[PDB]
Design a binder for these strands. Structure first.
Ligand SMILES: Nc1ncnc2c1ncn2[C@@H]1O[C@H](COP(=O)(O)OP(=O)(O)O)[C@@H](O)[C@H]1O
Ligand code: SF4
Ligand code: SF4
Ligand SMILES: [Zn+2]
Lengths: 194, 62, 416
RNA sequence: UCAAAGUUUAGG
RNA sequence: GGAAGGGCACCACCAGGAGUGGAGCCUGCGGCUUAAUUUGACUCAACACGGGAAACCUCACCCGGCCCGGACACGGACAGGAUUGACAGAUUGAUAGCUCUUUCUCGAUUCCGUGGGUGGUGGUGCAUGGCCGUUCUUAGUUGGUGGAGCGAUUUGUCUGGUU
RNA sequence: GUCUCCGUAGUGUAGCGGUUAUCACGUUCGCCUAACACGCGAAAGGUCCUCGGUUCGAAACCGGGCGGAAACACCA
């Protein structure tokens, strides 16, 4: 029980400079099947992970090093919460938020950590591997996400995020430290927090 | 029905009726001159022979 | 000679192909096969009863064609006085074909290799499943059969069960009824017993080797009392012979009555050798893809071009591949081109108009590529290695890589 | 006023 | 039915004859052989049978070649003559104008589709008809009405004698 | 190793120095039968294991070759 995941790094993948390459090196496409699709024009070199073998020929060939084929357990295919595009990142779960209980996320970055927080914040809709809210709640039943998402979708819960990049905030807001806290007062708890 | 390569078909003929055919010339408008020689019993100008086109008579001056 | 054998094999391969295509009416054909030990009189008796029973076939067309077919084979068998070695394979009938040409046919031949298969059949078509099944499995295995009584050596094609050599020995007793001499006689007994293993190992080098490289793709020891174990692991046993020891069989009985017991036990392991050689080769092919290297090829567009040029060293092929070599021809200008096409690109294809001149470019009939590879790999680079889709590495090679590839003589660049 | 005499396409 | 009563036939026997089987050849068939050795029929009821004694023809078989005898229509093809039919000489087996170079010609024939025919000693006698042969050369076979049986059936069409 | 014996048409065996090498089966060919079987009538087939010797003459008698098969191998 194992399956491949095709990935293309869109920052590096330029179809125009390299020509095709992947197509010319693929034993699926040299046979003659729709495994890899690029054309001279059109951005992002598409792959099907179904038709792909997982031989790692195309990854070695691509001149920028745009591609990657990593294997995942076939157990996880059932449990997708978010995959943004084909040949892209594929999150499989969300944490299980509890009310009045500080949720501790821990694990290395680039493993769907920001996507999870954005989904829980309610910016992103769980596309759930499709790429719809009753269908999403039904997917997340018997679990605290349906409790969490119901709450989100009628009672508009206020999504606020302490950001990762702290050095980007100074070049946006202006004035004194005391002035900004006075402007954002809702609780009126300046002093005790200070 | 395996037809052999070197034997092949044998194409039948194709005629060439090269427009209207001429056997006469105009001498002094009124009179006429005859080009080709005629049957005794237009017999053609074969490269050496003189072959008929009906009664199958033939001639050649040596 | 070796070349004359290969021509005789190809002759029979061609003949076999023409007989499977034959086709005929009801059950007018005969497929008959005779093993080498068999008597012809017994076969001629069998046909005489089959002739008698055929006399009461109700339908006309079938009946009269059968009887005449049975009479022909009876007369062919009168010419031989014995069934030759390698058996006999008699193929009678009255085949239908183009031009409405219901023609009588008879092909008796002693085949190359010995055949251990009997078969009587009548049918609408001929049945060469025995012959083609033989032609695939040329793989010989050896059988050394040790016993305290005496040894035996023999070989084993997919069908045929041979005896090469055997001897019997006057071995000593187990015990010595003196106290002092017990030990000396026991050493003496063990030295006689070792000399016997040596002789068997020597005779085994005599028989199974050929030009300092053994003919048998394997070798089996079969015995009891840990006597095969004495031979197998001994330094006496030559390592070129020892490295092909696949089974050490435990058998009741000894000699030729133990032989066929040893074969029955050794079946799965002797079948698996082809599967193991497949894995080893495609495993060697796949390592070049796993690394950078670049001493590989794949696809008829590439693999053939590689073979044409700076040639391959090994040319891996899947049996089933179905890709075929057509010869396209022009009506007027007499221009031609050959291409290697897939099952859908060969069956119907509007590509083949001449275009430049402006005519219909007729695709004159094919032959299909596994056969083409075999025809002239000798005039290229060679080692045409047929593989199956059974192994995990083979399955990838068939399903993924299109069942065609090769291990090259050096690094090669490719473009487009 | 008692010898021996077995068998019978898969091919409709 | 290697059950029993009767009664019969030289395609049964008896008593005999003439024989065939043995020899040579004539001829039919099966096989092998071949380019092809065309084929049908294999117990009586296949095999001096097909009326079958083939030099040619017959003739299907084989290997070579010409010819259309391709109706009629619908059309296309209609004349810058559609495109039937031609001594050479090379070739050819041929004195087949079959083909290549050339003649010139019926002059409304043609060529191409399609529909569609036509022909067929091609296949199927297990698709049939007719015609023969055989069971079967013996004495056998049938319904109406009546009677017997639920009925299939039987009775009539029979113990006996006689032919 | 010893001593012993046996190597005969396809199979199993006879064979008293002068034989067409005996018998049975098997084989082919007729017939019988619708066919087969049985049955009837015919036919063909031996390197007499191998070589050398003795002999007027050897399948045999004698020698050695190559095979095959029994009995012995005990007292410590
Ligand atoms: N809007 C987008 N469209 C296409 N690709 C994206 C987008 N956002 C992110 N990606 C790709 O997905 C990868 C991981 O992003 P993401 O999953 O958001 O980060 P994290 O794993 O930290 O949550 C990036 O390398 C990027 O190339
Ligand atoms: S991985 Fe090997 S197979 Fe799958 S696409 Fe890239 S190349 Fe073709
Ligand atoms: S993948 Fe690397 S190579 Fe294939 S197209 Fe996109 S960029 Fe060019
Ligand atoms: Zn004239």
């Amino acid at each position: 029980k194992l399956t491949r995941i095709a990935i293309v790094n869109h920052d590096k993948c330029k179809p125009k400079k390299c020509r095709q390459e992947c197509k010319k090196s693929c034993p699926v496409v040299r046979m003659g099947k729709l495994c890899i699709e690029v054309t001279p024009q059109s951005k992002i070199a598409w792959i099907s992970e179904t038709l792909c073998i997982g031989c790692g020929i195309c990854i070695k060939k691509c001149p920028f090093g745009a591609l990657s084929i990593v294997n995942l357990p076939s157990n996880l295919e059932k449990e997708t919460t978010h995959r943004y595009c084909a040949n892209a990142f594929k999150l499989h779960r969300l944490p299980i938020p509890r009310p009045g209980e500080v949720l501790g996320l821990v694990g290395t970055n680039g493993i769907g950590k920001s996507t999870a927080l954005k989904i829980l914040a309610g910016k992103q809709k769980p596309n759930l591997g499709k790429y719809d809210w009753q269908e999403i709640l039904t997917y997340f039943r018997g679990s605290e996400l349906q409790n969490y998402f119901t709450k989100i979708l009628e009672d508009d819960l206020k999504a606020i995020i302490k950001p990762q990049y702290v050095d980007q905030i100074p070049k946006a807001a202006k004035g004194t430290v005391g002035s900004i806290l006075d402007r954002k007062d809702e609780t009126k708890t300046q002093a005790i927090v200070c | 029905k395996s037809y052999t390569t070197p034997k092949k078909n044998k194409h039948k003929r194709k005629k060439v009726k090269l427009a209207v055919l001429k056997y006469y010339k105009v001498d002094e408008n009124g009179k006429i001159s005859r080009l080709r020689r005629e049957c005794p019993s237009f017999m053609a100008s074969h490269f050496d022979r003189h072959y008929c086109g009906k009664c199958c008579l033939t001639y050649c001056f040596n | 000679s070796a070349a004359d054998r290969n021509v005789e094999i190809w002759k029979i391969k061609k003949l076999i192909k023409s007989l499977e295509a034959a086709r005929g009416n009801g059950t007018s054909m005969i497929s008959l096969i005779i093993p080498p030990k068999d008597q012809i009189s017994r076969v001629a008796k069998m046909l005489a009863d089959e002739f008698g029973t055929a006399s009461n076939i109700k339908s006309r067309v079938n009946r009269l064609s059968v009887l005449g077919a049975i009479t022909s084979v009876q007369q062919r068998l009168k010419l031989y006085n014995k069934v030759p070695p390698n058996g006999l394979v008699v193929y009678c009938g009255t085949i239908v074909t183009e031009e409405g040409k219901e023609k009588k046919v008879n092909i008796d031949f002693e085949p190359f290799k010995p055949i251990n298969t009997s078969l009587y059949l009548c049918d609408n078509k001929f049945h060469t499943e025995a012959l083609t099944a033989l032609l695939s499995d040329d793989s010989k295995f050896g059988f050394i059969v040790i016993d305290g009584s005496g040894a035996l050596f023999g070989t084993l094609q997919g069908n045929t069960r041979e005896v090469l050599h055997k001897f019997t020995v006057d071995l000593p007793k187990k015990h010595g009824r003196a106290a002092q001499s017990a030990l000396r006689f026991a050493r003496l007994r063990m030295e006689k017993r070792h000399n016997y293993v040596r002789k068997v190992a020597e005779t085994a080098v005599q028989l199974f080797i050929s030009g300092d490289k053994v003919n048998v793709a394997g070798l089996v020891l079969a015995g009891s009392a840990d006597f095969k174990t004495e031979l197998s692991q001994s330094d006496m046993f030559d390592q070129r012979l020892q490295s092909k020891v696949l089974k050490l069989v435990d058998i009741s009985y000894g000699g030729e009555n133990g032989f066929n017991q040893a074969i029955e036990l050794s079946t799965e392991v002797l079948s698996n050798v082809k599967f193991i050689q497949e894995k080893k080769l495609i495993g060697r092919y796949f390592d070049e893809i796993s690394q950078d290297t670049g001493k590989y090829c794949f696809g008829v567009e590439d693999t053939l071009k590689a073979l044409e040029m700076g040639a391959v060293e090994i040319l891996i092929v899947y049996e089933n591949l179905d890709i075929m070599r057509y010869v396209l021809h022009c009506q007027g200008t007499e221009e031609e081109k050959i291409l290697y096409l897939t099952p859908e690109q060969e069956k119907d294809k509007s590509h083949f108009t001449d275009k430049e001149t402006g005519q219909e470019h007729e695709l004159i009939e094919s032959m299909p590529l596994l056969e083409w590879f075999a025809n002239n790999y000798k005039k290229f680079g060679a080692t045409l290695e047929i593989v199956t889709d059974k192994s995990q590495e083979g399955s990838q090679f068939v399903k993924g890589f299109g069942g065609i590839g090769g291990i090259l003589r050096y690094r090669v660049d490719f473009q487009g």
